[PDB]
Amino acid sequence: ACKSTQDPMFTPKGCDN
């Protein structure tokens, strides 16, 4: 269970996908 926070240092592959 990951936090949904889409930013330049965050990677969406595996969390917000």
From Swiss-Prot:
Cysteine disulfide links: 2-15
Disruption phenotype: Mutants show a significant reduction in the efficiency of extracellular protein secretion. They are also defective in twitching motility.
Compartment(s): Fimbrium; Cell inner membrane; Host endoplasmic reticulum membrane
UniProt modification remark: Methylated by prepilin peptidase PilD at the amino group of the N-terminal phenylalanine once the leader sequence is cleaved.
Coiled coil segments of this chain: none
Domain notes: PilA subunits constituting the T4P exhibit a classical pilin fold featuring an extended N-terminal alpha-helix linked to a C-terminal globular beta-sheet-containing domain, which are packed tightly along the pilus. The N-terminal helices constitute the pilus core where they stabilize the tubular assembly via hydrophobic interactions. The alpha-helical core of the pilus is surrounded by the C-terminal globular domain of PilA that coats the outer surface of the pilus, mediating interactions with the surrounding environment.
Family: Belongs to the N-Me-Phe pilin family.
Function: Major component of the type IV pilus (T4P) that plays a role in surface and host cell adhesion, colonization, biofilm maturation, virulence, and twitching, a form of surface-associated motility facilitated by cycles of extension, adhesion, and retraction of T4P fibers. In addition, plays a critical role in type II secretion of exoenzymes by interacting with specific components such as XcpT or XcpU. Modulates host calcium signaling through interaction with host calcium-modulating cyclophilin ligand.
Subunit structure: Interacts with itself to form a multimeric tubular filament structure with a diameter of 51 Angstroms. Interacts with PilJ. Interacts with PilS at the inner membrane. Interacts with type II secretion system (T2SS) components XcpT, XcpU and XcpW.
Protein name in UniProt: Type IV major pilin protein PilA
Organism annotation: Pseudomonas aeruginosa (strain ATCC 15692 / DSM 22644 / CIP 104116 / JCM 14847 / LMG 12228 / 1C / PRS 101 / PAO1)
